[PDB]
């Protein structure tokens, strides 16, 4: 993975040693070259993972997440240009340095072969993420959002640190390949009930699990656009990727320990989908939408069926591009009206015909219109949960109805009706904004042709 | 006033000075080259060559091979009267069940 780690690090010298007026051009161009080379990670074999060295490996689960991570960095640089156009040159480069250092940690996190190395890099993404929110956030609440984002993750992570080190002493190694062969079943005892919770609650809070999500409406709303894209597209998937790994060493205790979290997830997604029907803030509505889609992933990982693990991988990648696109669309409006209220600017389809086309495609994939990979992942999880229990079809179906209601409600309030009379500065959509939306939706709709590359190791 | 603070600046519409602006930068020279790198490296390279690269992956996940192998075994077993597929993946002779 040194062929991606080293180039990413070289983006820091490139930014600091480039001309004053070329920091965006040079960082965007070279971060796109890095994304192009990540396609070499698709050399996946049907029996064995692609094991590079003692430190790093890449199977069919890490590869789609790695390509998504390296693809977002240039998109994050396009989004941030407007609101950083009038900031001190050194601080513009510090902002970019934070994004690069965040990509550096992520790709090493998704490829670490040893769980303690995974934990360090999993836990290292907090520092650059917190700095982005609190320093370059726009509101006063950004300071309270960082603390919520910080102590929710750490409150769950620190127990995970104890559990991981405990497992190494007992097993003798945290290397994932070793655990695949030396794993022993987990006896049903009170001691193992709290081993299981320690290994999972760290990853639950990042998904997030309903109940432990109050940090997400704060961190995804008070952060800049570049922060909101990585937060919702990738950083929520560190929880999903973690559970997809650590549940190997938690059987058969997951059979009964998953009940409280399945109920919180099955019922939680109805609750959070309903919240989206009455949200007065457009960005906050998108944040609450993430909790509902990530509730399907938690259920998908906790039932442990091949159809559920294929759905979870597709759902994470699918929601990664859709959630990022929605934040960008909501941000294009904000850069004109400078307010997050949903009911302030209306009928925008009359003034921005092409940007409303992106709104339609963003909403259609959000409500899982087939044959989009959004529907493929959600469909696979529904089939897997039906076999788990036929009654779950009621909750899954109800969420599909509510999901389509708030998705189109967001599309009808801002893109239809009558334009707000007193808003007279809705300038035509820039090429930067239009290209930002294409780079989301176009790769999202292409994966439908060959979806096997986002279906994970169990394909 | 409670302090000496600059009044809040008004927003700058990049269309006013450069009606051909692509939204990337105030400088027209930088603005055009910002757009070219995004489009060429984003659309002409990653999406088009990446799409072609993914389309021609050399038998991703060994799925095409397993189809040929299944055909070879099905032909072999049907030509000798053996069952198409047995209920035991491992020969019981190597298994030593308790007591």
């Amino acid at each position: 993975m040194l062929k991606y780690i080293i180039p990413t690090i070289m983006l820091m010298p490139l930014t600091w040693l480039s001309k004053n007026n070329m920091i965006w051009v040079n960082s965007t161009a070279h971060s796109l070259l890095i994304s192009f080379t990540s396609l070499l990670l698709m050399n996946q074999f049907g029996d064995n993972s692609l094991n590079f060295s003692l430190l790093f490996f890449s199977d069919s689960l890490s590869t789609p997440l790695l390509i998504l991570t390296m693809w977002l960095l240039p998109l994050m640089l396009m989004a941030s240009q407007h609101h950083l156009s009038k900031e001190n040159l050194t601080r513009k480069k510090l902002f970019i340095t934070m994004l690069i250092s965040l990509q550096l940690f992520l790709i090493m996190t998704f490829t670490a072969m040893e769980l303690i190395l995974f934990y360090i890099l999993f836990e290292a993404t907090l520092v650059p993420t917190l700095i982005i929110i609190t320093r370059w956030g726009n509101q006063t609440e950004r300071l309270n959002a960082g603390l919520y984002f910080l102590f929710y993750t750490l409150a769950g992570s620190l127990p995970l640190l104890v559990a991981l080190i405990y497992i190494q002493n007992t097993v003798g190694s945290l290397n994932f390949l070793m655990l695949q062969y030396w794993v022993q079943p987990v006896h049903n005892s009170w001691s193992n009930v709290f081993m299981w919770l320690a290994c999972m609650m760290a990853f639950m809070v990042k998904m997030p699990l309903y109940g432990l999500h109050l940090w997400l409406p704060k961190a995804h709303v008070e952060a800049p656009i570049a922060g909101s894209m990585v937060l919702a597209a990738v950083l929520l998937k560190l929880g999903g990727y973690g559970m997809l790994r650590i549940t190997l060493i938690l059987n058969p205790m997951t059979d009964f320990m998953a009940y409280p979290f399945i109920m919180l997830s099955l019922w939680g997604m109805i609750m959070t989908s309903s919240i989206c029907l009455r949200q007065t803030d457009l960005k906050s509505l998108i944040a609450y939408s993430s909790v509902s889609h990530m509730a399907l992933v938690i259920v998908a990982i906790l039932i442990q069926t091949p159809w559920s693990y294929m759905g979870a991988t597709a759902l994470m990648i699918a929601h990664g591009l859709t959630s990022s696109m929605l934040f960008c669309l909501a941000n294009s409006n904000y850069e004109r009206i400078h307010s997050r209220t949903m009911i302030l600017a209306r009928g925008l389809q009359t003034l921005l015909p092409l940007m409303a086309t992106w709104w339609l495609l963003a909403s259609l994939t959000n409500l899982a219109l087939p044959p989009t990979i959004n529907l493929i992942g959600e469909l696979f999880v529904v089939m897997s949960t039906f076999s788990w229990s036929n009654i779950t079809i009621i909750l899954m179906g109800v969420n599909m109805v509510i999901t389509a209601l708030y998705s189109l409600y967001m599309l009808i309030m801002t893109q239809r009706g009558k334009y707000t009379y007193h808003i007279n500065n809705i300038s035509p959509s820039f090429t930067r904004e239009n290209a930002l939306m294409s780079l989301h939706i176009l790769p999202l709709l292409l994966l439908t042709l060959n979806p096997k590359i986002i279906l994970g190791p169990l394909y | 006033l409670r302090w000496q603070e600059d009044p809040e600046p008004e927003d700058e519409n990049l269309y006013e000075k450069n009606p051909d602006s692509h939204g990337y930068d105030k400088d027209p020279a930088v603005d055009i080259w910002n757009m070219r790198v995004v489009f060429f490296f984003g659309f002409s390279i990653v999406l088009v060559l990446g799409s072609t690269f993914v389309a021609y992956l050399p038998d991703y996940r060994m799925q095409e091979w397993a189809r040929r192998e299944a055909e070879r075994l099905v032909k072999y077993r049907e030509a000798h009267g053996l069952p198409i597929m047995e209920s035991n993946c491992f020969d019981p002779s190597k298994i030593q069940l308790p007591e």
């Binding site: 370059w136 956030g137 726009n138 509101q139 006063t140 400078h338 | 409670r2 302090w3 809040e8 600046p9």
Partner: peptide
């Protein structure tokens, strides 16, 4: 609008003997 930065009201919370 413009990014928010602390005013005198916010800072004087940290000027007392205790928090």
């Amino acid at each position: 609008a413009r990014q928010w930065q602390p005013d005198v009201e916010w800072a004087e919370q940290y000027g007392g003997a205790v928090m």
